[PDB]
Amino acid sequence: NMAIVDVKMVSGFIPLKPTVKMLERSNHVSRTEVSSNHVLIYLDKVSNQTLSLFFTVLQDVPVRDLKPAIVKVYDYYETDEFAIAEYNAPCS
Ligand SMILES: *[C@@H]1O[C@H](CO)[C@@H](O)[C@H](O)[C@H]1NC(C)=O
């Protein structure tokens, strides 16, 4: 069943509303799991689709040096390559 989940925020960009959107969404199977910096609601039958949402972040620090913001974990099947997938915050 759907187990892997990892997404963090940009460096000092601290989250305020992500708690709200964590609490909000609940679709046919639910755990309300949350690890105090993350969000964990994935469990379901075999699912191959994706969905959409919107989340932004609160500002703790003025500056951002040019070093991109990709938080990538990747583990989906033993045989194929485990399939990294990246794109930077072009604000840099
Ligand atoms: C998703 O992929 C699997 C691969 O075996 C397939 O069996 C299944 O019919 C597909 N559809 C869903 C959403 O389960």
Side-chain angles (χ1 to χ4, degrees):
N1 203 288
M2 311 310 153
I4 193 75
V5 62
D6 295 80
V7 165
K8 85 186 82 184
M9 310 297 158
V10 191
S11 197
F13 295 70
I14 200 155
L16 158 55
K17 198 258 282 181
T19 63
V20 187
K21 65 105 177 182
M22 173 271 306
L23 186 146
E24 211 186 12
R25 192 72 62 85
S26 314
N27 307 144
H28 178 274
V29 285
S30 50
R31 199 69 168 160
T32 187
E33 175 50 54
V34 71
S35 174
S36 289
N37 311 315
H38 320 123
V39 179
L40 295 87
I41 312 290
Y42 279 180
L43 62 91
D44 47 52
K45 285 182 181 169
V46 174
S47 303
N48 316 333
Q49 69 101 50
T50 198
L51 74 174
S52 52
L53 64 89
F54 59 100
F55 85 99
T56 187
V57 283
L58 184 139
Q59 181 267 10
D60 211 324
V61 193
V63 185
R64 180 61 273 161
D65 311 272
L66 69 167
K67 179 69 183 68
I70 43 167
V71 47
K72 272 41 166 172
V73 75
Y74 56 98
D75 51 355
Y76 314 97
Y77 199 55
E78 69 286 359
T79 72
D80 52 2
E81 190 257 354
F82 283 118
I84 303 100
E86 300 170 6
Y87 163 74
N88 62 359
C91 285
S92 192

